[PDB]
């Protein structure tokens, strides 16, 4: 019953709508929900030179890429939450349903 | 002129020695150098330098054996040969007396000039 | 102690700034009565916010200088504490009162500067502001004690005690009063 749905996404409002959708689906299917626990955002940071040559003033580019991680833990037999999580998928987020 | 000695070992006792005693004899870098493995990969050419040196003539100085090596330790086995060690341009004609033991075969060359 | 706030163990009240001019830009009495020289600050926020820093903290700030000692206020607080002990022994006065007197006696009244009728140039004499008086007074007796202690057995705490005693006196022996009188002399020589 104790099953772990984690959502890893680069875009935030996408992830938030998926987090909302799984709470909606859970409270409708009448099963105990642990709310969307927000793990710290990881900021992948790469900083390079701008110029292809080396005949300019030393200006650097600061490239960032945030990656967000939510998880909701439910008390439900595999099936009903599997069919809840088989609907309403968008390209931004990525799903993991963990049983044990 | 008084017959010199390695660590506390007579020059013919250095000659009458297996590699693990000769390891403990000379300095640390050279102990690791020979302990790492044996010469039948890249140092198939070290098996060739063994061959070349141990092919010695009668009572007269041996033929100058040219070498494209600088990364070769001089052991008691190789003492008393004429060798050309490669400068990149030239082969440097030098003999390796027993004072060159535990030294790199390259370490007898100069390339440049003082103005 | 809900009434009086003895600076470590030195009384706040019964210290009087005699000079009317330097009275506003010297904080020692009644509301700037604090236990430590150390504090947060925010005295570099606006223009004349600096005038409200306790003079003991102003001295503690000015002391930590010459590169190797930039931002060692704990070491500077212990130097000021040891100096106040030594002042009290040799003098027998309130060390805060001796400091206030040394600040007054060291601050110049007139300085030389470059002015106009723009074309060529001219070095005339001008006044120093009551803030500039106290600013340069602190700097002079800090650098006086500093350079005196450099390559010497006399420790920084002893050199500070020497400068503050001799400057509060008006000796011309402290680097403070010596240099003050040099600037006021040049200021006169071309007025």
């Amino acid at each position: 019953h104790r099953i772990r749905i984690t959502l890893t996404s680069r875009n935030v409002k996408s992830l938030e709508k998926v987090c909302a959708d799984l709470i909606r689906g859970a409270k409708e299917k009448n099963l105990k929900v642990k709310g969307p626990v927000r793990m710290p955002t990881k900021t992948l940071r790469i900083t390079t030179r701008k110029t292809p040559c080396g005949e300019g003033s030393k200006t650097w580019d600061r490239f960032q890429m945030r990656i967000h991680k939510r998880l909701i833990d439910l008390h439900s037999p595999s099936e009903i939450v599997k069919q809840i999580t088989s609907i309403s998928i968008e390209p931004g987020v990525e799903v993991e349903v963990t049983i044990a | 002129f008084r017959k010199f000695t390695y660590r506390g070992v007579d020059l013919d006792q250095l000659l009458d020695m297996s590699y693990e005693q000769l390891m403990q004899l000379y300095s640390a870098r050279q102990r690791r150098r020979l302990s790492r493995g044996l010469r039948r990969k890249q140092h198939s050419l070290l098996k060739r330098l063994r061959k070349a040196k141990k092919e010695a003539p009668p009572m007269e100085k041996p033929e100058v054996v040219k070498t494209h090596l600088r990364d070769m330790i001089i052991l008691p086995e190789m003492v008393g040969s004429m060798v050309g060690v490669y400068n990149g341009k030239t082969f440097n004609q030098v003999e390796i007396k027993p004072e060159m033991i535990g030294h790199y075969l390259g370490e007898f060359s100069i390339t440049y000039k003082p103005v | 102690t809900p009434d009086i706030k003895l600076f470590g163990k030195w009384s706040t009240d019964d210290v009087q700034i005699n000079d009317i001019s330097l009275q506003d830009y010297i904080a020692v009495k009644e509301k700037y009565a604090k236990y430590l020289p150390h504090s947060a600050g925010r005295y570099a926020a606006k223009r004349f916010r600096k005038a409200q820093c306790p003079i003991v903290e102003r001295l503690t700030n000015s002391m930590m200088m010459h590169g190797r000692n930039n931002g060692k206020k704990l070491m500077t607080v212990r130097i000021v504490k040891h100096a106040f002990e030594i002042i009290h022994l040799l003098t027998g006065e309130n060390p805060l009162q001796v400091l206030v007197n040394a600040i007054i006696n060291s601050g110049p009244r007139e300085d030389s500067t470059r002015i106009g009728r723009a074309g060529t140039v001219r070095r005339q004499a001008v006044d120093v502001s009551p803030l500039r008086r106290v600013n340069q007074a602190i700097w002079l007796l800090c650098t006086g004690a500093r350079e005196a202690a450099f390559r010497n057995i006399k420790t920084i705490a002893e050199c500070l005690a020497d400068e503050l005693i001799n400057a509060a006196k008006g000796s011309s022996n402290s680097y403070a009063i010596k240099k003050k009188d040099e600037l006021e002399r040049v200021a006169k020589s071309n007025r």
Binding site: - | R7, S27, E99 | -
Partner: protein, 144 residues
């Protein structure tokens, strides 16, 4: 205790070396070429010598015995990895060196590598940088 005792050895002599008595003993015996602060402190430990005294105040019997300590290391239970000449090419004996003995072995070792014609010896002959330093902009006070 604190007034100058009689026979205060102001100017001591340890292997033809004019050592000061005014300096503390651990930092005084390092005037000898081949002993530093490290080797001085461990020897003045090994010989049960109180190092709270100055080099004027110690006794002559204590100067003699501690000179025997400095020349004889292993007779007084000192490590082999502590020595400035370890596993020599000639005698194969790990032995500490003192004042003039260093200058002897240093002169020998420079002439040694010079005559056996090692590139290290060649740079030592030319008086250049030998441990592979870039000399494009360094060692200029050397050659005027």
């Amino acid at each position: 205790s604190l007034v100058i005792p009689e026979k205060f050895q102001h100017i001591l002599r340890v292997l033809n070396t004019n050592i000061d008595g005014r300096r503390k003993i651990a930092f005084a015996i390092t005037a000898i070429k081949g002993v530093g602060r490290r080797y001085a402190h461990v020897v003045l430990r090994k010989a049960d010598i109180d190092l709270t005294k100055r080099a004027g105040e110690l006794t002559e019997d204590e100067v003699e015995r501690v000179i025997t300590i400095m020349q004889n290391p292993r007779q007084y239970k000192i490590p082999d990895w502590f020595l400035n000449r370890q596993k020599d090419v000639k005698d194969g004996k790990y032995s500490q060196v003192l004042a003039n003995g260093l200058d002897n072995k240093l002169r020998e070792d420079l002439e040694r590598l010079k005559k056996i014609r090692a590139h290290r010896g060649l740079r030592h002959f030319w008086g250049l940088r030998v441990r592979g330093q870039h000399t494009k902009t360094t060692g200029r006070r050397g050659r005027t």
